[PDB]
Structure 1
Amino acid sequence: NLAPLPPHVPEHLVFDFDMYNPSNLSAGVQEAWAVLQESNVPDLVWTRCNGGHWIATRGQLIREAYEDYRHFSSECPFIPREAGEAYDFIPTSMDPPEQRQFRALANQVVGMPVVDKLENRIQELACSLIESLRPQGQCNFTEDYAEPFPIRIFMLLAGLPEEDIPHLKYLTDQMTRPDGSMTFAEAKEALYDYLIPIIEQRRQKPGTDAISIVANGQVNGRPITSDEAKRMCGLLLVGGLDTVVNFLSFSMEFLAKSPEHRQELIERPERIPAACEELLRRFSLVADGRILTSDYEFHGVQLKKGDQILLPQMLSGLDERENACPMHVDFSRQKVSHTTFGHGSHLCLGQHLARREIIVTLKEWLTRIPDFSIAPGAQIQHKSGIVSGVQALPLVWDPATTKAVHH
């Protein structure tokens, strides 16, 4: 339930929002979070849920905090406190200047140069999976394409066997949307338990895979340690198994419900890149934060050292003060403003990979299965957390309105 209100918190700023189970969940997860942006709600509130923490509700506040790493540290970035304290991935748990040197190494394994070179494999996997579903006239998108498409692409890049997916997928999910069976510390340790032996073997006999590159990597001229490699690989694992996987579902759910918007992409293919950005704004899904390094007055609100503050990446683009008709999806929107990949020194390094996976999915799906919809009488349930997602997305279509395209 609720944590007792801290001495310095003003009662008029209390809004008991629960990030792991928002009250307006059934209306759609983004909609649930948007309640924090209704006219009467202040720019900075305090919730007594999940141990108690502040919550910036507007893009201006969210962008500011992420830029100011001196007052807002990434050292304890998760809600609840025990999870944030136990979180030590690299570079996500570091603040500049220390974290800077580690980004370059991560770029070597997931940056644009590597992505460009994966294009053919990404398109090939997308086409086989899709053509595999096309004649069926149905599927549950989360298990049939959303999880397998991005996860296998990553498992390949990392040199990790596909049979290890169910175990790793379960562990990463306990870190973002815990079902209660595991604490954040335990899931993290089980992940390190999986990676440790592998990093040791990759340093003994290195291959060309992502993990061999990081384990035998160098940061600012010095060699990376075994502990630092483990901390970087864990972050990469969560990225391949719990980011794009959830995003693809929100996107396909929307496309399933808007024969209009998909028709726009079928008729005008060149706007798919632009559509991707708009969908990334409308269906933003990440929400982590920072911890106060000292007593600080921020926009008239007294914050005390150690207070945690959620800065939902998903909220910036949904803010009416950033985009005029927020809940409306407009592919032709002139200034698609958002912070879906973060803001400040920690801007997502996997975004280039993310965009190619989204863009290839939209093009290869619409090209083969242009007509489709939500299964008869099904009500789509969303799930909330550090990374929001979709519980199940069953789709249906008439096979006769599809077409097999050779890749």
Structure 2
Amino acid sequence: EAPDVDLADGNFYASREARAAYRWMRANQPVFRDRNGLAAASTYQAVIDAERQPELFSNAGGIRPDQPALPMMIDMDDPAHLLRRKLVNAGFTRKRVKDKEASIAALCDTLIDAVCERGECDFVRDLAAPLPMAVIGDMLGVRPEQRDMFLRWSDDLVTFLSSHVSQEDFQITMDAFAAYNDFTRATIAARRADPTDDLVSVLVSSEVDGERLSDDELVMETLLILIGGDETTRHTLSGGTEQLLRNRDQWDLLQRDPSLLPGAIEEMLRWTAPVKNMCRVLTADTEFHGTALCAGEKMMLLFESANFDEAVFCEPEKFDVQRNPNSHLAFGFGTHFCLGNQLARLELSLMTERVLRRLPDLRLVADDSVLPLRPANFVSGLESMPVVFTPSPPLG
């Protein structure tokens, strides 16, 4: 019998029985309808087939199941989406991202410096959560002592996207946006007058097809980057490292062979799939992999379910840093494929190599049945991950 689940309920994704539910979907009704009738593509095949038909499976209704669209790239269809993405792509060329390596590595070593003498830290609070915010913060011109304010704004906004909030939480979300809007428009004014080499400067100078980004668009697109690149990367760092620590053979492989790190990062992404789903609105009635869908309803793409689809990944519940091929969908697929995928991968690589060498005997304090996942229906991962290691002196 079908699992009795609510795919819009954050508690489903905090359950370590979600993958058992996915497995039933993939085997019995690939395009699944949950207890409330919400449609979701659970197989790798169905997700890809939906991704490849944007004119039928549109982003222009918004990518959350019961929230309207926002005027940002991820809530647009081509050709408007393509122009917006080309404009923002100025901040994410392969050259610009690769050149961040030294600065990201410095942040990684500073963060490890803050705990390496203690012999214990919360891997989430002290390493996985701060790094993505410090990288994005530095791109946006945020003073280091103000990162924590932005981290909380991002948390508030992620949480709004991850649930159906109350009025008090709707108001908190509006307040956080208002504060982010004020900050960003101040930056935009400052950089239109005296350009630097930061993200707002590059986005202001970007030109495509004779077009440029308006102030309104700069705020919206930088907000998408703030939210989209923060707590997502966090959860792959924490959850991916968790799997290295639970399977010591995997930890040991990476420690003795640095050339295995790219493959490890890909398996961390496949396993953690921080973005649990993105929605598509149907533009017409359609029979899709055996399920009738109605014009105007939203269908979820279950990226974690796809990442554990036995039709594509042999023994998907085995964490294997050497997995080849590893064509996971953590970043999605098609025209909306994650714009920050190179930056996310760079953050994950630089922090993980440093964790491996500087905390070489790292181990989890307690096991996973007690480690909670954050209840959220959009982006989710570990709340906390206490770890211990032999102390060492900082690098400075």
Give the match for residue 397 of structure 1: 389
CA RMSD of aligned residues (A): 2.5
CA distance in 2, matches of 1:155, 1:320: 39
Which residue, 38, 45, 57 being the options, matches 1:60?
A: 45
| Mapped partners of 2:342, 2:13: distance in 1 | 32
Q: Does the residue aligned with 1:342 lie in a helix, a strand or coil?
A: coil
Aligned to 2:352: 362
Pair 1:405–1:100, CA change in 2 (3 A): same
Task: State, as a whole percentage, how many aligned pairs show the same letter.
Answer: 27
1:274 corresponding residue in structure 2: 263
What is the identity, as a one-letter code, of the residue corresponding to 2:218? A
Equivalent position amino acid for 2:94 in 1: M
Alignment partners' CA distance in 2, 1:201 and 1:131: 33
Equivalent-residue separation in structure 1 for 2:101 and 2:13 (angstroms):
39
Q: Which 10-residue stretch deviates more, 125-134 or 182-191? A: 182-191
2:21 maps to amino acid: V
Structure 2 equivalent of residue 237 of structure 1: 226
Residues 13 and 377, structure 2, Cα contact 8 Å, conserved in 1: no
Distance verdict in 2 for CA 1:206–1:406, change over 3 Å: closer
Instruction: Work out the CA distance in 1 between the residues paired with 2:340 and 2:262.
Output: 17
Question: Residues 105 and 217 of structure 1 are in contact (CA less than 8 Å); yes or no, is this contact kept in structure 2?
Answer: yes
| Counterpart in the other structure of 1:37 | 23
Task: Tell me how far apart the structure 2 counterparts of residues 259 and 339 of structure 1 sit (CA, whole Å).
Answer: 26
Relative distance call for 1:294 and 1:200 in structure 2 (3 A) is farther
Q: How does 1:91-110 map to 2 (within 5 A)?
A: 91-110=73-92
Structure 1: distance between partners of 2:300 and 2:134: 32
Contact 1:372 1:396 in 2 (8 A): yes
Q: How does 1:79-118 map to 2 (within 5 A)?
A: 79-81=64-66, 83=67, 85-89=68-72, 91-118=73-100
The one-letter code matched in structure 1 to 2:80 is E
Asked whether 1:183 is paired with 2:170, we answer yes
| Corresponding residue to 2:54 among 47, 66, 69 | 69
Give 1:320 shift: 1.0
**How far does residue 274 in structure 1 lie from its aligned partner after superposition?**
1.0
Unpaired runs of 5+ in structure 2? none
CA deviation after TM superposition for structure 1 residue 74, in Å: 0.6
SS at match of 1:279: helix
Which residue identity is paired with 1:155?
G
Per the normalisation by structure 2, the TM-score is 0.89
Partner of 1:300: 290
Q: CA deviation at 1:404?
A: 5.3
Structure 2 CA distance for partners of 1:324 and 1:140, relative to 1, 3 Å:
same
Structure 2 residue matching 1:302: 3-state secondary structure: strand
Aligned twin of 1:333: 323
- Comparing 65-74 and 200-209, the one that deviates more: 200-209
Taking the aligned partners of 1:88 and 1:163, their CA distance within structure 2 comes to: 30
Quickly say closer, same or farther: Cα 1:369–1:335, change in 2 above 3 A.
Answer: same
Residue in structure 2 matched with residue 5 of structure 1 by the alignment: none
Structure 1 SS opposite 2:292: strand
Residues 190, 288 of structure 1: alpha-carbon distance in 2 compared, 3 angstrom cutoff:
farther
Secondary structure at the residue paired with 1:389? coil
Task: Compute the displacement of 1:360 (Å).
Answer: 1.0
**Pair 1:322–1:371, CA change in 2 (3 A):** same
Cα 1:209–1:235 change in 2 (3 A) is same
Runs (5+) with no aligned partner, structure 1: 1-11
Question: CA 1:299/1:80 → structure 2, altered by over 3 Å: closer, same or farther?
Answer: closer
Q: Which amino acid aligns with 2:253?
A: E
AA of the residue aligned to 1:394: P
- Tell me, yes or no, if the aligned pair for 1:246 and 1:390 is still in contact at 8 Å: yes
**By how many angstroms is 1:295 displaced?**
1.8
Shift of the 86–70 alpha-carbon distance from structure 1 to 2, 3 Å rule, reads closer
